């Protein structure tokens, strides 16, 4: 029950479902989520994935209480992942949003990076993909302040493709997924795969640097 | 008559002129267009190029009926190319727009990538330059859906620098070209050349990957 | 008196102060400014730097009258620099703005690149960072025309994070700086340092090309 | 008969067999060779490929008589290709050797790049992979002179891993292939695939530049 | 006693000392070794580090019996590390050798990569640094065969700078370290740091790809 | 007389001629040398350049007595430069050798990097091109020790293509130049230009980092 899954017309929707913990990613939820992404890749009945959260929060981040060296786990996918951001997407949860190919946001969406507030460095690509998707200045402002970015500003900045009234969110994400499903899937997958290969070639160096920064930070922190 | 050309105050305007075929790029029009770009480069009376289409469409893409391994042909230019997008710019036509240094759009402009609809992969840089100029999420949404991007959204996303009423389009493009012509041309050409060299260094890897993806797609398609 | 400095709650504000020369960067002001940035880095009482100009101009650029091979001098910093753009930021002054981590603009702000007007090529990163922060098309339009970009367009394009009424400018910059100061400084500095390392890895090739273009331009200019 | 093929203990040996035309790559031989590489990839009974030529020449290059825009065709492989160089490997034939993962040479081997002699630019990666595998100075010396590199110098320069007496060549290549076959194939293929991905990330930009240089050369040549 | 350490004339020598386990890197030895490298960096009495092993083996690799996700731990150093390779350097031990700035080898030295034999992928940079330091062909031959590279071939290939009689090894390494100590240390450290920054910029993308390949391999292996 | 020049059969030979100062590069000699390279590029009677020194030294480096911020000046050339290394090539002189496309060495040749001995960091590409042309380990050994590399080791390492008896040096360089002159010059220049563009794309980031390291070193040195 901590992860819901639904397959409908070649679209798999994955719903983070720990609303009482604001969909925080416990170890168990991590295992289920990343496992579900991998299963979607290998499932020949799935063309598109939608990820979302049970209201009122998209994902508050990692369950820090429960836990640190937090390795990246988002798998190589050849199928598009649409993030239907229904609420706050914070830190590790902002990183889940940044992994998506396409984002659509409820008016209730908001985005924040609290890594520096809580004294952790990112290891799931925030430091590469946030400046890539909202611009250097805004990424730096977000990360260093830990302030919320509204849905409207996220749209202005290019973080999301659309903002809809809250109750239309999953419909809006399904409509985009249906447009994709209706196109030539050999071409969709080949073109997405290529886009990922073009992007990876540009992000790889950064992701390594991010990893090494996090490691150095953790190690120096063990001067205590 | 399939390509019009006009030189006025050191600005060469090239107009795709097959309006009845929505300015689709036949083999002949390709030869004329790319040939004209090359001639503009070597013509010492030209500082700036404007490309546009006969109404109501900018360019509907390659003439697919007539035709496939479609090699890139846009030449090395040291002079700025302004695209005056007067209508729909689709697929290969969106790639012509993405090659321009600067875009200005009529309110009647719209942009779409139908490669995945029609079962072709891009070979004129769409997969590199679309995410570069409208952002990763929007590029992926466009490519995988094949949906139109409006003139206003194109402006919001950074695809175009300006949107004007339809009848002001060529005037708006000429005004920008005149501002350029009025500056130090040695500096204009040296600075543009450098901008192109800086950009090429970042896009080259991607363009190769795009080419290889297209090739692999074509070859696997010859499992039929 | 040509550079003012003030330290307050772990924020150092540096004010270019030659308003009668529109804060043009003379040799002396360059020495003071870059020297002050370096001192801020080594000063353990400073977490954040704000740069601004005495009204009504942010910085009109280098003092060209007084002067050319103008080497880059902005030092390696591990602390964030917020640019509080109070007025026109032109050419070398636009480059000072482009060096900042975060920009906030008065409604009175405007941005222009007159390098090509005045027959100089950039050597302080404009040709790398302008397309990075406002997009390729707009950067090329700005550089080749030398036209002003308004505060509102700068906000739309992602050049600045915010635009405020003129009298609120320094308050708005101090509020952002205070949010940063209130977070874990070990994390702030480590994350910023990493962001800079990720970015430098992407800009280095471009900056070298910019330098070489400027050099070739200067050398060919000595065919006179 | 223009391409021989043999499968033995999970090793596929492909022999260019037009010895009377010094194994020149006609259109037909190209189709057969590249087709055979692709079939080896998909053949689950093959772990390793050896390529070689019927004596006394490895490959004299493309059949130029018969033919120009010569697109690259070496496919994505996840299996190692050992080149057993039995004689001269010239121009397009040197490029076939440079595509191999591992080279072993007969004492009778020699290598030359005659592209500049014959007025053609490379399109099968010579200009990237020759400096990569023999060093910048030697690559430039080879390409600009068109002089032969001996087997012994090829060994000194790192172009080949070993040089054997002529009659031991295929035995030496089979021994290496047998060592590979005897290791964990899941690991062999995963590690090779990774090596290729690491290398491609470094060569892609170069290969694009090579392609564009060749194109510009061909186009300017059509000023005649 | 599992790691020996000695400081003499501003040179710290670290000796792996589990000769009965062929200096295999247990968890404890890993902690001691990487900890010692970090301490050398911060120790103001040390200019140069020499790493070596108790005879007859340099390092047989990780203690696999004892153990898998084996994260990289070699720290950022601004001081040169000379590897005095006294015997076999295998797999993880070859990676320790590949991390060194400079290698000198006993005649008794040999090098092998058994990752593919033992069904593991590298995570300490072998897949980036082996082709960098011995050339693509030889790296691929080594990795896929798991065959030993002799001291003499290692010298021919550029893996080591020198090969000495066994009893002269540490003297030869101390002589090089003494030459370094005798030069301007501010310059030595600044130049080394720069060399590392130049190299890291080229290896980072590869190291990320290596990490991701290893992860994917481990995850697929958990289909069992 | 400080620079000799000779044109013979489309080969321009430039001889550094301050043998009493071991061909040290004074300001005047720098101006003449770099000026001569530029003139060779524009001279339509020249296909190839040979650089050499009056015996017994190739180039001892910059005239340090006479002088520091030493900017790079080697121009963009589309014609090959062969370095005929007749004696010691030290520091700035090793950098002149590293700029050449092809090197041939007298038995009397030797190479050294004394930057760290004399407390200077390189600004003419040593820190990029030395590891590129002799391998990382040997470059680091050379730079940090300041020890001489013999002609024979230079040949083993790939720094030079050939080593000849002293009296045959210029004949050997002329023979290579004659082979180049005898090939299709349109192809020679196009292929060389491409090789330079492929290489520049890989070295640019490094050269920027080198420049920034040198600058930081000079600036910190002004803590005195
Ligand atoms: C350390 As994390 C998963 O919040 O980037
Ligand atoms: C194959 As096309 C010219 O539409 O990118
Ligand atoms: C030459 As400048 C400091 O205006 O980029
Ligand atoms: C044009 As060719 C196949 O000899 O590189
Ligand atoms: C997994 As390992 C430390 O042998 O590269
Ligand atoms: C500072 As220098 C010309 O010896 O690299
Ligand atoms: Ca299913
Ligand atoms: Ca943007
Ligand atoms: Ca004309
Ligand atoms: Ca203080
Ligand atoms: Ca079979
Ligand atoms: Ca080598
Ligand atoms: Ca001590
Ligand atoms: Ca002449």
Cα–Cα distance, B181 to B167 (Å, whole number): 23
**Does ligand 1 have an atom closer than 6 angstroms to the CB of A210?**
no
Asked if residues A142 and C190 have their Cβ atoms less than 8 Å apart, the reply is no
Q: In what order do the strands lie in the sheet with A110-112?
A: A88-90, A110-112, A149-150
Cis geometry, peptide bond prior to residue B161 (ω within 30 degrees of 0): no
Q: How far does residue C124's CA lie from ligand 3's centre (Å)?
A: 6
Task: Please say whether the beta carbons of A209 and C197 come within 8 A.
Answer: yes
Instruction: Write out the two tokens for B198.
Output: 């800086």
A149-150 and A110-112: which strand pairing?
A: antiparallel
- Please give the Cα distance from C215 to C71 (Å, whole number): 11
Residues C159-173: b if buried by 16+ CB within 10 A, e if exposed: bbbbbbeeeebbebb
> Counting ligands in written order, which one lies closest to the CA of residue F47?
14
Q: Which of F66, F47, F59 is nearest to F15 (CA)?
A: F59
Cis amide bond preceding C134, omega within 30 = no
Helix (H) or strand (E) holding C15: strand C11-16
Nearest partner of E125 among E199, E175, E72, judged by Cα: E72
Assign 3-class secondary structure to E25-89: ECHHHHHHHHHHHHHHHHCCCCCEEEEEECCCCCECCECCCCCCCCCCCCCCCCCCEEEEECCEE
d(CA E49, CA E181): 11
B201: contact with F, CB 8 A cutoff: yes
DSSP C179-190: HHHTS-HHHHHH
Q: Read off the tokens for D59.
A: 């490959």
Structural domains in chain E, CATH included, are 1-224 (3.90.226.10)
Nearest-neighbour CA in chain B from A132: distance (Å): 8
Rounded to whole angstroms, how far apart are CA atoms D5 and D37? Answer: 11
CB–CB contact E211 A216 (8 Å): no
F120 CA: nearest ligand 6 atom: 1
Is D120 in a helix, a strand, or coil? coil
Residues facing residue C166 across a β-bridge: none
Residue C205 near residue C93, CB atoms below 8 Å: no
Residues B117, B27, B214: CA angle, nearest 5 degrees: 40
* DSSP code for A83: E
Angle (CA) F195 F201 F202, round 5°? 95
Cα A176 to Cα A104: distance, rounded to the nearest angstrom: 10
* CA atoms within 13 A of residue B211's CA, in its CB half-sphere: 20
Segments in chain C forming alpha helices (H)? 27-42, 92-99, 126-134, 136-145, 151-157, 169-181, 185-221
- By CA distance, what is B199's nearest residue in F? F201
**What is the spatial distance between Cα E62 and Cα E92, in angstroms, rounded to a whole number?**
6
Neighbours of D142 (CB within 10 A): 26
**To test the ligand 5 pocket, which listed residue (E96, E113, E123, E125) has its Cβ within 8 A of the most ligand atoms?**
E123
Give the C-alpha separation, C90 to C57, whole Å. Answer: 9
Contact assessment for residue A115 and residue C191, using Cβ atoms and an 8 Å cutoff? yes
DSSP F79: S
Please identify, by atom number, the ligand 6 atom nearest to the C-alpha of residue F61. Answer: 4
Distance (Å) from the C-alpha of residue F134 to the closest C-alpha of chain D?
9
Q: How many other CB atoms are found less than 10 A from the CB of residue A138?
A: 25
Strand order through the sheet with C110-112: C88-90, C110-112, C149-150
Given a contact cutoff of 8 angstroms between Cβ atoms, the answer to whether B87 and B58 are in contact is yes
3-state secondary structure of A1: coil
**Burial code of C4-33, b = ≥16 C-beta within 10 A, e = fewer?**
eeeeeebbbbbbbbbeebbbbbbeebbebb
Residue whose token pair is 């590979």:
D180
Kindly state whether E209 is in contact with chain D, defined as any CB-CB distance less than 8 angstroms.
Answer: yes
Helix (H, G, I), strand (E, B) or coil at D219: helix
Q: Positive or negative, the Cα torsion across B213, B215, B221, B222? A: negative
Q: Do chains D and B touch (3 or more CB pairs under 8 A)?
A: yes
The tally of CA atoms less than 13 A away on the side-chain side of residue B43 is: 17
Q: How far is Cα D54 from Cα D52, in angstroms, rounded to an integer? A: 7
**Residues E8, E15: Cα–Cα separation, whole Å:** 14
Q: Which residues of C touch A118 (CB under 8 A)?
A: 184
Instruction: Reply yes or no: is the peptide bond before residue B56 cis, omega within 30 of 0.
Output: yes
For chain A, the chains sharing at least 3 beta-carbon pairs closer than 8 angstroms are B, C, D, E
Give me B209's structure tokens.
Answer: 């990957």
Characterize the bridge pairing of strands B149-150 and B110-112. antiparallel
Kindly report the number of other CB atoms within 10 A of residue D27's CB atom.
Answer: 11
Q: Is D190 in contact with E121 (Cβ distance < 8 A)?
A: yes
Q: Which residues of C touch E194 (CB under 8 A)?
A: none
Taking the CA atoms of residue B112, residue B199, residue C131 and residue A114 in that order, the dihedral angle to the nearest 10 degrees is: 90
Strand extents, DSSP E, chain A: 3-8, 11-16, 48-53, 81-85, 88-90, 102-106, 110-112, 149-150, 162-164
Helix (H) or strand (E) holding A202, with range, is helix A185-221
Question: How far is residue D54 from each of residues B24, D15, D60, D177, measured CA to CA in Å?
Answer: 50, 6, 12, 20
Tokens of A151: 């849905």
Let me know if D224 is exposed, middle or buried by CB neighbors in 10 A (0-12, 13-18, 19+): exposed
Contact D98, D133 (CB under 8 A): yes
Question: What is the distance between the alpha carbons of residues A27 and A200, in angstroms, rounded to a whole number?
Answer: 27
Q: Which residue has the tokens 């997009």?
A: C135
Instruction: Mark yes or no for CB contact A75/E216 under 8 Å.
Output: yes
Phi-psi region of F51 (alpha: psi -120 to 50; beta: other; left: phi over 0): beta
CB F127 within 8 Å of CB F213: yes
Chain C partners within 8 Å of A224 (Cβ):
none
Using a CB–CB cutoff of 8 Å, tell me whether C172 touches chain A.
no
Give the HSE-up count for residue E26: Cα atoms under 13 Å, Cβ half-sphere: 14
- CA distance linking residue A110 with residue A170, whole number of Å: 17
Q: Which listed ligand is nearest to B24 at the C-alpha?
A: 2
The experimental resolution of this structure, in angstroms, equals 1.9
- Rounded to whole angstroms, the Cα distance separating C130 from E57 reads 55
CA of E218 to the centre of ligand 5 (A): 12
Token pair, residue A19, equals: 């609303």
| Residue E62 CB less than 6 A away from ligand 5 | yes
Q: In what order do the strands lie in the sheet containing C3-8?
A: C3-8, C11-16, C48-53, C81-85, C102-106, C162-164
| SS3 readout for chain B | CCEEEEEECCEEEEEECCHHHCCCECHHHHHHHHHHHHHHHHCCCCCEEEEEECCCCCECCECCCCCCCCCCCCCCCCCCEEEEECCEEECHHHHHHHHCCEEEEECCCEEECCCCCCCCCCCCCHHHHHHHHHCHHHHHHHHHHCCCEEHHHHHHHCCCCEEECHHHHHHHHHHHHHHHHCCCHHHHHHHHHHHHHHHHHHHHHHHHHHHHHHHHHHHHHCCC
For D189, other C-beta atoms within 10 Å of its C-beta total 17
Beta-carbon contacts of residue A31 (< 8 Å; ≥ 6 apart): none
D204 has a chain E CB within 8 A of its CB: no
CB C98, CB C59: distance < 8 Å: no
- Listing from the earlier edge strand, what are the strands of the sheet with F162-164? F3-8, F11-16, F48-53, F81-85, F102-106, F162-164
The structure tokens listed for C117 are 């007007």
Contact yes or no for F44/F8 (Cβ under 8 A): no
Q: Which two tokens stand for residue A4?
A: 């819901």
The upper half-sphere exposure of residue C85, i.e. CA atoms within 13 Å in the direction of its Cβ, equals 34
Q: Do F161 and D141 touch (CB under 8 A)?
A: yes
Cα(F103)–Cα(B70) distance, integer angstroms: 42
Q: What is the largest CA-CA distance in chain B?
A: 57
Query: Strands of B88-90's sheet, edge to edge?
Result: B88-90, B110-112, B149-150
d(CA C155, CA C135): 12
Give the CA angle between residues B212, B218, B220 to the nearest 5°.
Answer: 100
User: Residue C165 phi/psi, 5° resolution?
Assistant: -55, 145
Point out the ligand nearest to the CA of residue B126: 2
- Residues from chain B that touch F204, judged by Cβ atoms under 8 A, are 201
Q: Which technique was used to obtain these atomic coordinates? A: X-ray
Dig out the tokens for E12 from the structure. Answer: 């710290």
Cβ atoms of C160 and C104 closer than 8 Å: yes
Closest partner residue to E208 among A38, A71, A204, by Cβ? A204
Nearest-ligand number for the alpha carbon of F10: 14
3-state secondary structure of A132: helix
Pairing of strands E102-106, E162-164: parallel
Residues of C in contact with E201 (CB under 8 A): 201, 204
Angstroms from B138 CA to nearest CA on chain C: 15
Give CA–CA dist E105/E97, Å, rounded. Answer: 10
Q: Does F205 touch chain C (CB under 8 A)?
A: yes
Query: Do the beta carbons of residue B61 and residue B93 sit within 8 Å?
Result: yes
What's the half-sphere exposure (Cβ side, CA atoms, 13 Å) at C114? 15
For the beta carbon of residue C200, count every other beta carbon within 10 angstroms. Answer: 18
> Looking at beta carbons, which residues of chain E come within 8 Å of C201?
201, 204
How many angstroms separate the CA atoms of F160 and F153, rounded?
A: 9
Neighbours of B92 (CB within 10 A): 25
Q: DSSP string covering A149-185, please?
A: EEHHHHHHHTS-SEEE-GGGHHHHHHHHHHHHHTS-H
Helix (H, G, I), strand (E, B) or coil at A37: helix
Query: Helix, strand, coil: what percent of chain C each, to 5?
Result: 45, 20, 35
Instruction: Return the C-alpha torsion angle C14, C20, C21, C23, nearest 10.
Output: 20
For the record, the structure tokens of D114 come out as 């005659």
Cα distance between residue B220 and residue B216, in whole Å: 6
Q: Could you give phi then psi for residue A44, rounded to 5 degrees?
A: -70, -10
Q: F171 Cβ partners below 8 Å, 6+ apart?
A: none
Rounded CA gap, E16 and E55, in Å?
9
Out of E122, E141, E220, name the one closest to residue D176 (CB): E141
* Alpha helices per DSSP H over chain D: 27-42, 92-99, 126-134, 136-145, 151-157, 169-181, 185-221
């Amino acid at each position: 029950e901590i992860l819901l899954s639904n397959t409908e017309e070649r679209v798999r929707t994955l719903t983070l479902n720990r609303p009482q913990a604001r969909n925080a990613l416990s170890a168990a939820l991590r295992d289920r989520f990343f496992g579900a992404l991998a299963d979607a890749e290998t499932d020949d009945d799935v063309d598109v994935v939608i990820i979302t959260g049970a209201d009122p929060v998209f994902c508050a981040g990692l369950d820090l209480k429960e836990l640190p060296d937090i390795s990246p786990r988002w798998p190589a996918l050849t199928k598009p992942v649409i993030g239907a951001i229904n609420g706050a997407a914070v830190t590790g949860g902002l990183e889940l949003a940044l992994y998506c190919d396409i984002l659509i946001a409820s008016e209730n969406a908001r985005f924040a990076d609290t890594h520096a507030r809580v004294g952790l460095l990112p290891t799931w690509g925030l430091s590469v993909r946030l400046p890539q998707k909202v611009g250097i200045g805004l990424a730096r402002r977000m990360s260093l302040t830990g302030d919320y970015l509204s849905a409207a500003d996220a749209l202005r900045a290019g973080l999301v493709t659309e903002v809809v009234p809250h109750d239309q969110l999953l419909g809006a994400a399904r409509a985009v997924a249906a447009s994709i499903v209706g196109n030539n899937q050999n071409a969709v997958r080949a073109l997405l795969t290529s886009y990922h290969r073009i992007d990876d070639a540009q992000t790889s160096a950064g992701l390594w640097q991010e990893a090494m920064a996090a490691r150095q930070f953790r190690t120096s922190g063990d001067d205590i």
